[PDB]
Design a protein around this nucleic acid. Structure first.
Lengths: 274, 313
DNA sequence: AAGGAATTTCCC
DNA sequence: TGGGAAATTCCT
């Protein structure tokens, strides 16, 4: 028949899930490689078919037994929670510019779930008793239950492919990593220089200041007590490999979260001689 | 009249975080303007030129321009329906209100909670139409077993419990003290001039919090000023905050400098990147110690002053 | 749209 | 007791 291949995966970490009351529609889901100027959008690529049909963009969970994720995907053509539209003919590459990821309070948890079953939302079909218990609200994998047509005009539902993980950047434990600004960016190649780093919310229990550099790797020394209300870290700089540098070395420093092994954008830092 | 309500002490006006309903059971109380270091103090009131036994009540009132019933309710002690009822009518008429809690209402449960509040007082003998609507100037300690608030008179409390719902200020509240003395047999009919205290402003309120400088980047710099300093602080508002350096002069005199920074320089209401100001006299030859403090442009409230040291170029 | 803050809840 | 963080409604 035909296969589904999502072209613009959803920006891993960027958007912040919104509650109904949160002015509902207040932005969409950015294309994986979106930029401040060049805005992109998640575009699917249904190969093996070129005509009409439908698309039912649903939202499940990030783990194999892909249960349907409780909170709704609102906006353009989004009904009862999911999304259901069509497929352009002279188009074998359709994108979705209009889709917010709304979150469900814990209070409204199981309700949203019943609303998941009362709507017949179950892309891979997982037994009701299985599709229960706990759910990972801070992350989802958009589903694509698109319908094509065999060589006779008969509708055909292909593989419900999943989108790369979408994490509620509002979630402290998986938001994006940013270094707003920093005290100083020079320090001695002997280390020990206290730095004041301002960052986007981080969880003290799970965070580190990572210092790269060809053949050299270390982290700044600090402590829980040194992270201020999740938006600042006062740490001491690490010794450089050469305890008697001869000329400025421009190493890199980025925020590192062990748990998901992710790193912030690198920031210039230059170790100066003794 | 003679016997009234004297507030011999009051809270600290700012410090306590008025807890809500789903925050847990009495995780604290309302202290008082008295640090002491060893012990402490709660809002203590008394009655001067008093009578014999007497029971004083207390209802949370709204700050605003027109004093009326406040949606929030007091909890614990002799409180019930947000109104504490204390006796303390032995020999002395000094009553201390300790371990009192304040429950914050939902930004939605205001109207509904208000309405009822304006009924628990109407029916009862305390603050009738003198804290709701001045059309029910009576129906207080009239002794009525339970006055049936006519579909007409109950609609008065409704209209009041409707307009006042849009004026309400959920972050500030004031304690009202109303004491009633005995009368005929033993019942407490007659009331003494009710007296409102100061505002206690919720702690979980940004524009009222207690300012503090947890720590700063550097605590010294050149008189020339203009040196960058990092400051980590307790929650503040970018638009309403300022760093202020100051010093004491001979006899009369106080120098004053403000840190140069844009609200954009305030990181998540917890940090500020600013530049030091020029010192009084950039001609000094010896280090001069000044004091730095965090201050709110609105209530001109300050913080614990920190010893900043200026030195020669 | 693309964010920063307020005030209730949630716990350590 | 506190009091920080997670939650979640509010407001450009």
């Amino acid at each position: 028949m035909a296969y589904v291949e999502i072209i613009e995966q959803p920006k891993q970490r960027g958007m912040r899930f919104r509650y109904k009351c949160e002015g509902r529609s207040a932005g969409s889901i950015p294309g994986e490689r979106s930029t401040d100027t060049t805005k992109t959008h998640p575009t699917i690529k249904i190969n093996g078919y070129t005509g009409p049909g439908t698309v039912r963009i649903s939202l499940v969970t990030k783990d194999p037994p892909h249960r349907p994720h409780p909170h709704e995907l609102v906006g353009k053509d989004c009904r009862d929670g999911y999304y259901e539209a069509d497929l352009c003919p002279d188009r074998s590459i359709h994108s979705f510019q209009n889709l917010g990821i709304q979150c469900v309070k814990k209070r409204d948890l199981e309700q949203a779930i019943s609303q998941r079953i009362q709507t017949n939302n179950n892309p891979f079909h997982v037994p009701i008793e299985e599709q229960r218990g706990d759910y990972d609200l801070n992350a989802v994998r958009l589903c694509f239950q698109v319908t094509v047509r065999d060589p006779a005009g008969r509708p055909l539902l292909l593989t419900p492919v999943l989108s790369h993980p979408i994490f509620d950047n509002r979630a402290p434990n998986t938001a994006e990593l940013k270094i707003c600004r920093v005290n100083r960016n020079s320090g001695s190649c002997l280390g020990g220089d206290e730095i004041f780093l301002l960052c986007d919310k981080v969880q003290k229990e799970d965070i580190e200041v990572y210092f790269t550099g060809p053949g050299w790797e270390a982290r700044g020394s600090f402590s829980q007590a040194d992270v201020h209300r999740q938006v600042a870290i006062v740490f001491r700089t690490p010794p450089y490999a050469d305890p008697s540098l001869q000329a400025p070395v421009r190493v890199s420093m980025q925020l590192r979260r062990p748990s998901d092994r992710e790193l912030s954008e690198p920031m210039e830092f230059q170790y100066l001689p003794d | 009249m003679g016997p009234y309500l004297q507030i011999l002490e009051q809270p600290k006006q700012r410090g306590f975080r008025f807890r809500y309903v789903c925050e847990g059971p009495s995780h604290g109380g309302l202290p008082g303007a008295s640090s002491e270091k060893n012990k402490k103090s709660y809002p203590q009131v008394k009655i001067c030129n008093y009578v014999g036994p007497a029971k004083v009540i207390v209802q949370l009132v709204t700050n605003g321009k027109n004093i009326h019933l406040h949606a929030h309710s007091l909890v614990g002690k002799h409180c019930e329906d947000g109104v504490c009822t204390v006796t303390a009518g032995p020999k002395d008429m000094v009553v201390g209100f300790a371990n009192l809690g304040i429950l914050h209402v939902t930004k939605k449960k205001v109207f509904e909670t208000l309405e009822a509040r304006m009924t628990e007082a109407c029916i009862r003998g305390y603050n009738p139409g003198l804290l709701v609507h001045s059309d029910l100037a009576y129906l207080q300690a009239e002794g009525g077993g339970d006055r049936q608030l006519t579909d007409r008179e109950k609609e008065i409390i409704r209209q009041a419990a409707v307009q006042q719902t849009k004026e309400m200020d959920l972050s500030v509240v004031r304690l009202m003290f109303t004491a009633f003395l005995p009368d005929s047999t033993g019942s407490f009919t007659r009331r003494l001039e009710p007296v409102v205290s100061d505002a206690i402003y919720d702690s979980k309120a940004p524009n009222a919090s207690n300012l503090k400088i947890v720590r700063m980047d550097r605590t010294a710099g050149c008189v020339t000023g203009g040196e960058e300093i990092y400051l980590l602080c307790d929650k503040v508002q970018k638009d309403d905050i300022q760093i202020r350096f100051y010093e004491e002069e001979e006899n009369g005199g106080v120098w004053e400098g403000f840190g140069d920074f844009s609200p954009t320089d305030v990181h998540r209401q917890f940090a500020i990147v600013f530049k030091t100001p020029k010192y009084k006299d950039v001609n000094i030859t010896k280090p001069a110690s000044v004091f730095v403090q965090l201050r709110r442009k609105s209530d001109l409230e300050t913080s614990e002053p920190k010893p900043f040291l200026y030195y020669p170029e």
